[PDB]
Design a protein around this ligand. Structure first.
Ligand SMILES: COc1cc(-c2cncc(-c3ccc(C4CCN(C)CC4)cc3)c2C)cc(OC)c1OC
Ligand SMILES: COc1cc(-c2cncc(-c3ccc(C4CCN(C)CC4)cc3)c2C)cc(OC)c1OC
Ligand SMILES: COc1cc(-c2cncc(-c3ccc(C4CCN(C)CC4)cc3)c2C)cc(OC)c1OC
Length: 284
C-alpha cells in the first residue's frame, strides 16, 4: 500500500555535549538536524515530545520540528529531528562575525518574535510556553539573516534548571513564584536581555566593536557555580557593562535602554516580549 522511508543518513557531528550529540543528517536528499539524547538528558526528549504532541508549533523564529523517534535496542535510543541551519548557533556566529545596524536589529527582532510567539496564549491556537534555557547557544542563524529559537527540552506550558550564567535573580535567590506561570516568562526576558547584550557588542559603530564575550565574563569563572552567580546578580546586583561607545550610536543607545528594562531585580517591572518587539520596530 505504501513505503514509509524512515532511514536518515548521519553525515557529520556538529555538536557533542552532556546532552548527547547533534548530527547533520540527510532524509530523501534534504538536510535535517538529528539530536541523539544522552541517558543524562532523556527527560528533555520526553518534555519536547510532550509539548509537540500538545501543540505543533510552526513559526519562522522557532526551530522547525520534523520528528521524535524512540528506537528499541538490547537500551532505548531517543532522536529529535528538526530543520538544519548550516550557519550554526548565534554563539558560534558572533565569534567570527561583526554586524551592521540592519543585521543586528534583524537578529534581535527575530529572536523577540520567536519568544513572543512562545509566550502568547492563542485560543481556538496554542498554550503559553516559557523556554527556561534561552541563551545564544540555543539560537540558530538562518541564511535570510533571521534567527530561530531551539531546545524546548526544559519548556513549560500554561493554558531541573537552566544554564546558571543566564539565570535571573529570583532563580538564584529562590524567591521565584513557582506556582505562577508569568514568573517563567519573566525569567526568559532576563535571559533575552543578556542575549541582546551579547549581540549588540558585535555591532560596529564609528569603527569600534567589542570582542565576543559571554554575559558576566568579567565577574565569574568559566562554568560559574550557582553561588558565584547569586553573589554577582543578587547580592551585589551587578549587570553587564554598557560601553561608552554605544552612547554615540542611536541604535546601540536604544538597545542599551531595552536591555536595562529586561534586567530589573523586580521581575514584574521587566518588559514583555511583545513590548520589546514594538520598541525594536521603532528603532532606526
Ligand atoms: C514513522 O517514522 C517516520 C516516518 C516518516 C515519514 C516517511 N514517509 C511518509 C510519512 C507519512 C506521512 C503522513 C502519512 C499520512 C497520510 C494520510 N493517512 C490517512 C495518514 C498518514 C503517511 C506517511 C512519514 C511520516 C519520516 C521519518 O523521518 C523523517 C520517520 O521517522 C522519524
Ligand atoms: C515528517 O516530515 C516530513 C514528512 C513528509 C511527508 C511524506 N509523506 C506524506 C506526507 C503527508 C501527506 C499528506 C498528508 C495529509 C494531507 C491531507 N489529508 C489527506 C490528510 C493527510 C499529511 C502528510 C508528508 C508530510 C515530507 C517531508 O518533507 C518533504 C517531511 O519533512 C522532512
Ligand atoms: C541548539 O539546539 C539544537 C540545535 C540544532 C542544530 C540545527 N541546525 C544546525 C546546527 C549546527 C549546524 C552546524 C554547526 C557548525 C558546524 C561546523 N561549521 C563549519 C560551523 C557550524 C553548528 C550547529 C544545530 C546544532 C539541532 C537541534 O536538535 C535537532 C538542537 O536541539 C534542539
Amino acid at each position: 500500500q505504501r513505503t514509509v522511508a524512515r532511514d536518515i543518513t548521519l553525515l557529520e557531528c556538529v555538536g557533542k555535549g552532556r546532552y548527547g550529540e547533534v548530527w547533520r543528517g540527510s532524509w530523501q536528499g534534504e538536510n535535517v538536524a538529528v539530536k541523539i539524547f544522552s541517558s543524562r538528558d532523556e527527560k528533555s526528549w520526553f518534555r519536547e515530545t510532550e509539548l509537540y504532541n500538545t501543540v505543533m508549533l510552526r513559526h519562522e523564529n522557532i526551530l522547525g520540528f520534523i520528528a521524535s523517534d524512540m528506537t528499541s535496542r538490547h537500551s532505548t535510543q531517543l532522536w529529535l529531528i528538526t530543520h538544519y541551519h548550516e550557519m550554526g548557533s548565534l554563539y558560534d556566529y558572533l565569534q567570527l562575525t561583526t554586524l551592521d545596524t540592519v543585521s543586528c536589529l534583524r537578529i534581535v527582532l527575530s529572536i523577540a518574535s520567536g519568544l513572543a510567539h512562545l509566550h502568547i496564549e492563542i485560543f481556538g491556537g496554542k498554550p503559553a510556553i516559557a523556554h527556561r534555557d534561552l541563551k545564544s547557544k540555543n539560537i540558530l542563524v538562518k541564511k535570510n539573516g533571521q534567527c530561530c529559537i531551539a531546545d524546548l527540552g526544559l519548556a513549560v506550558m500554561h493554558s531541573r534548571v537552566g544554564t546558571k550564567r543566564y539565570m535571573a535573580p529570583e532563580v538564584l535567590d529562590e524567591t521565584i513564584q513557582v506556582d505562577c506561570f508569568d514568573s517563567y516568562k519573566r525569567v526568559d526576558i532576563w535571559a533575552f536581555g543578556l542575549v541582546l547584550w551579547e549581540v549588540a557588542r558585535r555591532m560596529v559603530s564609528n569603527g569600534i566593536v567589542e570582542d565576543y564575550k559571554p554575559p558576566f565574563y568579567d565577574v565569574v569563572p568559566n562554568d560559574p557555580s550557582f553561588e558565584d552567580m547569586r553573589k554577582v546578580v543578587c547580592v551585589d546586583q551587578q549587570r553587564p557593562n554598557i560601553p561608552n561607545r554605544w552612547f554615540s550610536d542611536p541604535t546601540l543607545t536604544s538597545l542599551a535602554k531595552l536591555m536595562k528594562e529586561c534586567w530589573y531585580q523586580n521581575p514584574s517591572a521587566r518588559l514583555t516580549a511583545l513590548r520589546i518587539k514594538k520598541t525594536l520596530t521603532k528603532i532606526d
